[PDB]
């Protein structure tokens, strides 16, 4: 009768470096990377927790955590312990020694709350999911551990940690990036790919992490140490994302993105410019809370022979002034100033960027606050572009202020 | 050394009906009228008080006040009394027996004011759009020894005819007060201008309390500052004028001191649509004197479709969050939060209030569209003046105000 | 799988006058009355809604709602609509509009409710003190297929005479409703007990809007849930009782399910003073079902003087913040925030509301002192029944309610 | 006309170890130490900033700053940048701060976007009330490079201070660390100016000064030892008298400033709040001290028979305290303290959530946060049994921590 969420604590692992994002994550953690025009990546796991009815949240951070922590302080500031809500920011010769460690080192903060269930979450994915489903499967299945999994074509699973299960979705082995991924019994050509989401009873986990602290062998991670141990010595069960996913009617399939490369990151944002986007950012039934300030509305100015400030097939945030600049298939975060005779196409423009007059840019991700010099051309000369900026094989240039200065 | 604002309470009169705004205020007070894409009118006086360092605010409401009051409860909710801040929402009888006037609006609330014991009271009109630093006006008030300091616009005399006008001597001491003078008295030194009352009054609090008690005890008083309290002091006390230009907070992108009454639909339309200029008279992108309001986290603005027949786009326009511009042409328009403009529609010279829906093929020009209106598909406005005058409120200059009740009546 | 509370709106009827509480409610509505040292009565229904996971709450107020509305504005200010949460304060007057009854209180505000489109409405009285998890009642409602679920106390029949009583069958289906039955029908199989309505009702929103629109067009209706809406469904539709015992959130340290009307001065006094017990019926130190309220940061409680003639200390008492007990003796008393009790004074069996000041040498016994009352030096209460009755509101059991207007008229 | 606080930013140095406070700062920085019953020491500087009209605040922290950082996030969370308000918590994002100067230098990246005119450098480990608008007004007028807040102290007590030589217009002509013969004030000998560690700068000037300091690989990167000694000698340093800006309540007999540097001083400043006429008026609503506070139940006193009586005399007691058959005298209790039957506290400062077991009897103590006092424990009866059981000062105050109690089998 009583929702299990009332007795759950969501614990967000937010230390992921986002290595392959290169300069995008040079001074910010992957979960602090901007997404969608208004939010950051971590706001999704956090909003899922909130919307699922989980009132206690812990967030473990590791490297380059400064701006991630300031985001959390500014945006996620409305929890009060007298309402049995909490939001603890838990930063790391003093780092965490893995994903399991960050729970272990913080037991003293967890146990006063004494939650019945722990919902361990990866904070660097973009998805919407109602965790109450997973909680209910967990208590009703008697599992030691319930693991959230995507169903992906066997070929795609080769990059995931893959769970080998049986006909009752109990997990019988785990393999990191199996090159020939174990298929679902009775449904080959599909594999169960781990989402980095783990539901525990709280007391089992506590011991499970104590045990891990003691063992010299352990790399102190959930994926390699905690879980496989459980898989081999206890009862592990799979939960399928399709069962819990909160998809809008206007989302043609369950949405989940890792945005683990500049290409995947650029594509995921630019896809929001579609007539029918994969992600329905207008689904008010499952809203994404974030840090946002009061801003002026977007402004478009100039319209004559040679210049017209306008956006077409584009998404534009507040505090943006589009002055004689032509935008197409671009997403602009808050605060962008684009000036006369400049042009943007296939552009993901992060907060507070200035585009100088006459600049022309195509297929780019422009980093936070970058000032684009007047006249710069990107997307015309693949080879000059690759020398000046971080350019992908697909031809997306990631542009940072450091890159511009060296011009 | 100490700023006087620490010792002041701002008391905002927010019962303005905005009668000439017609259907725009049939269900809301004038201070609750939307402006500029995000805020409401009352947010300017409150942001002035905040930015000036005043920590205690009272707001007296009168007619049609629920949405104003809701706005205040939700947007102005961050003042804490044990930090010596306060924000009091004060409707007629206890959050018949209406306020009998603006002075009554204070008098009835003496028991709210007195516990705070502020040293000064700043009486504000909540129905004007303007930026002002009240600390200068406080300074002048104590340093001049006046009974009342009155905020005054310095306007050419032909404009002052619709204002309450203060007559000036050499030292800017007010020597009489005229309500809407046919030929306004001028300022000594430079004739050609007049001092028009802003409805801003600074008192020593104790002085003010005695006045409103005296006004309450006068059986022939109409119970207003403008008509009753102020004329009494101008004569039998010391009234002094403060010049708006001296306290006005101008951005360096604002060519002149900005103050707007938006007392008519043309004025309302004109003040909003002027924000679409390359160089508007009001700088809303300024940060050195910010306007706080009630704002919700919204998805960004979206523009879509780009084919032969339809292009979602905004030109020389201002567009807010949660707007979806789908195959619709926007030109010289101001869109508030939550507008959904649909394929093949067109908007020119439009002020479009929150949550409006523009149906496919609809074409609207020179309009103000009320909050939440659902424009039916294919509707045409701005083309047939007599038909346009027939179904909607239409001004002499050709502006159409459109409400849902007007749309509901549509069959011809 | 999905908790029904996500889909419910709580609607709190906070218009109780508390007539029998006499002077205690001469300027405040009953839901605004102080309870327990810090909170107000309305905070129990609101905290129940919040703890049950209901994110949308409306409060309908009626008479003397000034201080109630103020409390709700400052205390219950943390709901944000973009997180699908909302807190609407819905005063009977945007004067002329008064709600015609508890049913009119909803009907007039349909245009506040339907935009949120909740699936369930939970109608609550805002003037009782109790803890209850409404998810239990929601589930029963959807499982039972009923048109209304009604929350009911299980009370011994001779105490049931004072209540609105539902007749019940073996399936807890309500076959009749009786207002104050001289002989309350017992529960089948459990005579000796009867079901008393708590004035708590769960509906599907679509059904409730239907019923409310039917009621408004019926000119004979008293427009109340109690007299009109519920009895109509009882005879013509499907009403089922829900047992408070099943939903009540009882602490380990509460010997039974706790519910209190505090309808009389004696009952009010009794319910507060009971908190000074070694083992109170109400466990306020519970953290598993917390009661939220408006609270300010205050200094701690202070106890001073210990000489031969005066000692400030409290025995068998509960004392809040900002209290200074200066050479004063407290015994079996409950003090709200900001009480100043001065040298040589004594309080016994006293419920003392916020900001009360107790003058030197005063000695008060068996009292309720209203908010902000200054007790003059040397006043004696609880010594002479006839004198105390002449001066104050004295109950049959000898409880004196003391208000400042009673003190003002005094001099023996 | 325009108050200078509008253009100022307060930067609070909150990395003090409070080394002499021993186990009381075992796992927390000094600014995080509880004071007065409901607040922490850092809240005083912060409330001074806010009350003075300084709506931009940064806090630099160093060692053991977890609870300090949590307190700040929870309690000081009401600033919004779009109202030109900001509160930045700046932990050491290797590379600890090199000193209080380095604490500023690393965070130029945080400061410049706000571009304030003035920087008000504040020690976050003192208890005092001050209106910084006076010191700002003096600084801009004096035309000096740095203005330094100073206590006026009798020279006999100035020997334990950083003392500023002054001339007849309060220009600082020397700074001496703990002078044996502290230089006296011109025409007011017998009083010396003792630095409060409060400095006012122009922001541009301070950025240069901290950039120069960072370049010198020799420097100890501290305002006290490096930057301030450089300005007196080569630039323009001027003193600001605490008495000139202190916010002294009518019920405060003298300007109040406390360092609470030692266990005895900490105990003394807290227990002094139980006085009939305390030196610190914690009721002056005119200059209020904001902190992190939760809604809690009122304090409760229960039991009253021949053998036990729950009550407090000459005491200060917070919310969520249950005094159950326990007798308190001259004690200050923070939130959530449970004292059980037949127990007795005297001259006791008891930090939050402490449990006092039945029959326990304690005198002259500071009990650390959350400590559970075993039933029947006696402290303050036997000085030598106490000094080996707990940390006991020369004056006879016992600091009791949980790790000390856990060692008990004598
Ligand atoms: C807060 C941002 O508001 C906006 O004006 C848009 C366009 O998103
Ligand atoms: C805010 C907590 O207040 C109290 O209950 C006491 C006694 O300080």
mmCIF file with all atom_site columns, N, CA, C and O in Angstrom, chain D residues 249-276:
data_model
loop_
_atom_site.group_PDB
_atom_site.id
_atom_site.type_symbol
_atom_site.label_atom_id
_atom_site.label_alt_id
_atom_site.label_comp_id
_atom_site.label_asym_id
_atom_site.label_entity_id
_atom_site.label_seq_id
_atom_site.pdbx_PDB_ins_code
_atom_site.Cartn_x
_atom_site.Cartn_y
_atom_site.Cartn_z
_atom_site.occupancy
_atom_site.B_iso_or_equiv
_atom_site.pdbx_formal_charge
_atom_site.auth_seq_id
_atom_site.auth_comp_id
_atom_site.auth_asym_id
_atom_site.auth_atom_id
_atom_site.pdbx_PDB_model_num
ATOM 1   N N  . UNK D 1 249 ? 24.572 46.605 21.768 1.00 0.00 ? 249 UNK D N  1
ATOM 2   C CA . UNK D 1 249 ? 23.220 46.649 22.317 1.00 0.00 ? 249 UNK D CA 1
ATOM 3   C C  . UNK D 1 249 ? 23.181 47.585 23.534 1.00 0.00 ? 249 UNK D C  1
ATOM 4   O O  . UNK D 1 249 ? 24.191 47.771 24.204 1.00 0.00 ? 249 UNK D O  1
ATOM 5   N N  . UNK D 1 250 ? 22.025 48.190 23.802 1.00 0.00 ? 250 UNK D N  1
ATOM 6   C CA . UNK D 1 250 ? 21.868 49.036 24.985 1.00 0.00 ? 250 UNK D CA 1
ATOM 7   C C  . UNK D 1 250 ? 22.104 48.232 26.253 1.00 0.00 ? 250 UNK D C  1
ATOM 8   O O  . UNK D 1 250 ? 22.464 48.787 27.294 1.00 0.00 ? 250 UNK D O  1
ATOM 9   N N  . UNK D 1 251 ? 21.909 46.920 26.152 1.00 0.00 ? 251 UNK D N  1
ATOM 10  C CA . UNK D 1 251 ? 22.097 46.009 27.275 1.00 0.00 ? 251 UNK D CA 1
ATOM 11  C C  . UNK D 1 251 ? 23.426 45.272 27.186 1.00 0.00 ? 251 UNK D C  1
ATOM 12  O O  . UNK D 1 251 ? 23.579 44.166 27.704 1.00 0.00 ? 251 UNK D O  1
ATOM 13  N N  . UNK D 1 252 ? 24.387 45.909 26.527 1.00 0.00 ? 252 UNK D N  1
ATOM 14  C CA . UNK D 1 252 ? 25.761 45.436 26.500 1.00 0.00 ? 252 UNK D CA 1
ATOM 15  C C  . UNK D 1 252 ? 26.668 46.534 27.060 1.00 0.00 ? 252 UNK D C  1
ATOM 16  O O  . UNK D 1 252 ? 26.728 47.630 26.508 1.00 0.00 ? 252 UNK D O  1
ATOM 17  N N  . UNK D 1 253 ? 27.360 46.236 28.160 1.00 0.00 ? 253 UNK D N  1
ATOM 18  C CA . UNK D 1 253 ? 28.118 47.245 28.908 1.00 0.00 ? 253 UNK D CA 1
ATOM 19  C C  . UNK D 1 253 ? 29.383 47.746 28.201 1.00 0.00 ? 253 UNK D C  1
ATOM 20  O O  . UNK D 1 253 ? 29.907 48.816 28.525 1.00 0.00 ? 253 UNK D O  1
ATOM 21  N N  . UNK D 1 254 ? 29.868 46.978 27.237 1.00 0.00 ? 254 UNK D N  1
ATOM 22  C CA . UNK D 1 254 ? 31.049 47.351 26.461 1.00 0.00 ? 254 UNK D CA 1
ATOM 23  C C  . UNK D 1 254 ? 30.984 46.646 25.112 1.00 0.00 ? 254 UNK D C  1
ATOM 24  O O  . UNK D 1 254 ? 30.265 45.655 24.973 1.00 0.00 ? 254 UNK D O  1
ATOM 25  N N  . UNK D 1 255 ? 31.708 47.165 24.108 1.00 0.00 ? 255 UNK D N  1
ATOM 26  C CA . UNK D 1 255 ? 31.834 46.476 22.821 1.00 0.00 ? 255 UNK D CA 1
ATOM 27  C C  . UNK D 1 255 ? 32.240 45.014 23.012 1.00 0.00 ? 255 UNK D C  1
ATOM 28  O O  . UNK D 1 255 ? 33.189 44.744 23.740 1.00 0.00 ? 255 UNK D O  1
ATOM 29  N N  . UNK D 1 256 ? 31.532 44.088 22.376 1.00 0.00 ? 256 UNK D N  1
ATOM 30  C CA . UNK D 1 256 ? 31.779 42.670 22.594 1.00 0.00 ? 256 UNK D CA 1
ATOM 31  C C  . UNK D 1 256 ? 32.586 42.062 21.462 1.00 0.00 ? 256 UNK D C  1
ATOM 32  O O  . UNK D 1 256 ? 32.189 42.128 20.304 1.00 0.00 ? 256 UNK D O  1
ATOM 33  N N  . UNK D 1 257 ? 33.719 41.468 21.817 1.00 0.00 ? 257 UNK D N  1
ATOM 34  C CA . UNK D 1 257 ? 34.548 40.713 20.886 1.00 0.00 ? 257 UNK D CA 1
ATOM 35  C C  . UNK D 1 257 ? 35.162 39.542 21.648 1.00 0.00 ? 257 UNK D C  1
ATOM 36  O O  . UNK D 1 257 ? 35.730 39.730 22.727 1.00 0.00 ? 257 UNK D O  1
ATOM 37  N N  . UNK D 1 258 ? 35.019 38.333 21.109 1.00 0.00 ? 258 UNK D N  1
ATOM 38  C CA . UNK D 1 258 ? 35.620 37.147 21.700 1.00 0.00 ? 258 UNK D CA 1
ATOM 39  C C  . UNK D 1 258 ? 36.281 36.285 20.646 1.00 0.00 ? 258 UNK D C  1
ATOM 40  O O  . UNK D 1 258 ? 35.747 36.084 19.549 1.00 0.00 ? 258 UNK D O  1
ATOM 41  N N  . UNK D 1 259 ? 37.448 35.768 21.010 1.00 0.00 ? 259 UNK D N  1
ATOM 42  C CA . UNK D 1 259 ? 38.251 34.925 20.150 1.00 0.00 ? 259 UNK D CA 1
ATOM 43  C C  . UNK D 1 259 ? 37.987 33.464 20.453 1.00 0.00 ? 259 UNK D C  1
ATOM 44  O O  . UNK D 1 259 ? 38.197 32.604 19.603 1.00 0.00 ? 259 UNK D O  1
ATOM 45  N N  . UNK D 1 260 ? 37.482 33.207 21.658 1.00 0.00 ? 260 UNK D N  1
ATOM 46  C CA . UNK D 1 260 ? 37.353 31.858 22.222 1.00 0.00 ? 260 UNK D CA 1
ATOM 47  C C  . UNK D 1 260 ? 38.459 30.903 21.740 1.00 0.00 ? 260 UNK D C  1
ATOM 48  O O  . UNK D 1 260 ? 38.189 29.842 21.177 1.00 0.00 ? 260 UNK D O  1
ATOM 49  N N  . UNK D 1 261 ? 39.710 31.294 21.972 1.00 0.00 ? 261 UNK D N  1
ATOM 50  C CA . UNK D 1 261 ? 40.852 30.548 21.469 1.00 0.00 ? 261 UNK D CA 1
ATOM 51  C C  . UNK D 1 261 ? 41.230 29.301 22.252 1.00 0.00 ? 261 UNK D C  1
ATOM 52  O O  . UNK D 1 261 ? 41.853 28.397 21.708 1.00 0.00 ? 261 UNK D O  1
ATOM 53  N N  . UNK D 1 262 ? 40.852 29.247 23.524 1.00 0.00 ? 262 UNK D N  1
ATOM 54  C CA . UNK D 1 262 ? 41.213 28.141 24.408 1.00 0.00 ? 262 UNK D CA 1
ATOM 55  C C  . UNK D 1 262 ? 39.975 27.513 25.009 1.00 0.00 ? 262 UNK D C  1
ATOM 56  O O  . UNK D 1 262 ? 38.918 28.125 24.995 1.00 0.00 ? 262 UNK D O  1
ATOM 57  N N  . UNK D 1 263 ? 40.107 26.312 25.564 1.00 0.00 ? 263 UNK D N  1
ATOM 58  C CA . UNK D 1 263 ? 38.954 25.630 26.139 1.00 0.00 ? 263 UNK D CA 1
ATOM 59  C C  . UNK D 1 263 ? 38.311 26.440 27.270 1.00 0.00 ? 263 UNK D C  1
ATOM 60  O O  . UNK D 1 263 ? 37.087 26.518 27.366 1.00 0.00 ? 263 UNK D O  1
ATOM 61  N N  . UNK D 1 264 ? 39.120 27.055 28.127 1.00 0.00 ? 264 UNK D N  1
ATOM 62  C CA . UNK D 1 264 ? 38.558 27.872 29.197 1.00 0.00 ? 264 UNK D CA 1
ATOM 63  C C  . UNK D 1 264 ? 37.800 29.079 28.661 1.00 0.00 ? 264 UNK D C  1
ATOM 64  O O  . UNK D 1 264 ? 36.760 29.437 29.192 1.00 0.00 ? 264 UNK D O  1
ATOM 65  N N  . UNK D 1 265 ? 38.337 29.717 27.625 1.00 0.00 ? 265 UNK D N  1
ATOM 66  C CA . UNK D 1 265 ? 37.705 30.912 27.056 1.00 0.00 ? 265 UNK D CA 1
ATOM 67  C C  . UNK D 1 265 ? 36.393 30.560 26.379 1.00 0.00 ? 265 UNK D C  1
ATOM 68  O O  . UNK D 1 265 ? 35.416 31.292 26.499 1.00 0.00 ? 265 UNK D O  1
ATOM 69  N N  . UNK D 1 266 ? 36.382 29.438 25.667 1.00 0.00 ? 266 UNK D N  1
ATOM 70  C CA . UNK D 1 266 ? 35.173 28.939 25.026 1.00 0.00 ? 266 UNK D CA 1
ATOM 71  C C  . UNK D 1 266 ? 34.106 28.608 26.060 1.00 0.00 ? 266 UNK D C  1
ATOM 72  O O  . UNK D 1 266 ? 32.947 28.971 25.902 1.00 0.00 ? 266 UNK D O  1
ATOM 73  N N  . UNK D 1 267 ? 34.497 27.915 27.120 1.00 0.00 ? 267 UNK D N  1
ATOM 74  C CA . UNK D 1 267 ? 33.562 27.594 28.184 1.00 0.00 ? 267 UNK D CA 1
ATOM 75  C C  . UNK D 1 267 ? 33.043 28.885 28.806 1.00 0.00 ? 267 UNK D C  1
ATOM 76  O O  . UNK D 1 267 ? 31.841 29.052 28.992 1.00 0.00 ? 267 UNK D O  1
ATOM 77  N N  . UNK D 1 268 ? 33.952 29.811 29.091 1.00 0.00 ? 268 UNK D N  1
ATOM 78  C CA . UNK D 1 268 ? 33.589 31.060 29.755 1.00 0.00 ? 268 UNK D CA 1
ATOM 79  C C  . UNK D 1 268 ? 32.591 31.889 28.936 1.00 0.00 ? 268 UNK D C  1
ATOM 80  O O  . UNK D 1 268 ? 31.616 32.387 29.470 1.00 0.00 ? 268 UNK D O  1
ATOM 81  N N  . UNK D 1 269 ? 32.838 32.036 27.638 1.00 0.00 ? 269 UNK D N  1
ATOM 82  C CA . UNK D 1 269 ? 31.983 32.874 26.798 1.00 0.00 ? 269 UNK D CA 1
ATOM 83  C C  . UNK D 1 269 ? 30.576 32.300 26.686 1.00 0.00 ? 269 UNK D C  1
ATOM 84  O O  . UNK D 1 269 ? 29.602 33.046 26.623 1.00 0.00 ? 269 UNK D O  1
ATOM 85  N N  . UNK D 1 270 ? 30.471 30.974 26.659 1.00 0.00 ? 270 UNK D N  1
ATOM 86  C CA . UNK D 1 270 ? 29.175 30.317 26.639 1.00 0.00 ? 270 UNK D CA 1
ATOM 87  C C  . UNK D 1 270 ? 28.451 30.378 27.974 1.00 0.00 ? 270 UNK D C  1
ATOM 88  O O  . UNK D 1 270 ? 27.260 30.659 28.014 1.00 0.00 ? 270 UNK D O  1
ATOM 89  N N  . UNK D 1 271 ? 29.164 30.094 29.058 1.00 0.00 ? 271 UNK D N  1
ATOM 90  C CA . UNK D 1 271 ? 28.523 30.054 30.360 1.00 0.00 ? 271 UNK D CA 1
ATOM 91  C C  . UNK D 1 271 ? 28.110 31.461 30.781 1.00 0.00 ? 271 UNK D C  1
ATOM 92  O O  . UNK D 1 271 ? 27.137 31.636 31.490 1.00 0.00 ? 271 UNK D O  1
ATOM 93  N N  . UNK D 1 272 ? 28.827 32.470 30.295 1.00 0.00 ? 272 UNK D N  1
ATOM 94  C CA . UNK D 1 272 ? 28.492 33.862 30.580 1.00 0.00 ? 272 UNK D CA 1
ATOM 95  C C  . UNK D 1 272 ? 27.108 34.244 30.048 1.00 0.00 ? 272 UNK D C  1
ATOM 96  O O  . UNK D 1 272 ? 26.485 35.194 30.520 1.00 0.00 ? 272 UNK D O  1
ATOM 97  N N  . UNK D 1 273 ? 26.611 33.494 29.075 1.00 0.00 ? 273 UNK D N  1
ATOM 98  C CA . UNK D 1 273 ? 25.280 33.758 28.544 1.00 0.00 ? 273 UNK D CA 1
ATOM 99  C C  . UNK D 1 273 ? 24.181 33.396 29.535 1.00 0.00 ? 273 UNK D C  1
ATOM 100 O O  . UNK D 1 273 ? 23.025 33.766 29.341 1.00 0.00 ? 273 UNK D O  1
ATOM 101 N N  . UNK D 1 274 ? 24.533 32.696 30.608 1.00 0.00 ? 274 UNK D N  1
ATOM 102 C CA . UNK D 1 274 ? 23.535 32.329 31.607 1.00 0.00 ? 274 UNK D CA 1
ATOM 103 C C  . UNK D 1 274 ? 23.405 33.423 32.676 1.00 0.00 ? 274 UNK D C  1
ATOM 104 O O  . UNK D 1 274 ? 22.528 33.344 33.532 1.00 0.00 ? 274 UNK D O  1
ATOM 105 N N  . UNK D 1 275 ? 24.277 34.433 32.624 1.00 0.00 ? 275 UNK D N  1
ATOM 106 C CA . UNK D 1 275 ? 24.235 35.553 33.579 1.00 0.00 ? 275 UNK D CA 1
ATOM 107 C C  . UNK D 1 275 ? 22.883 36.268 33.597 1.00 0.00 ? 275 UNK D C  1
ATOM 108 O O  . UNK D 1 275 ? 22.144 36.223 32.614 1.00 0.00 ? 275 UNK D O  1
ATOM 109 N N  . UNK D 1 276 ? 22.567 36.928 34.711 1.00 0.00 ? 276 UNK D N  1
ATOM 110 C CA . UNK D 1 276 ? 21.380 37.773 34.766 1.00 0.00 ? 276 UNK D CA 1
ATOM 111 C C  . UNK D 1 276 ? 21.543 38.917 33.772 1.00 0.00 ? 276 UNK D C  1
ATOM 112 O O  . UNK D 1 276 ? 20.612 39.246 33.042 1.00 0.00 ? 276 UNK D O  1
#
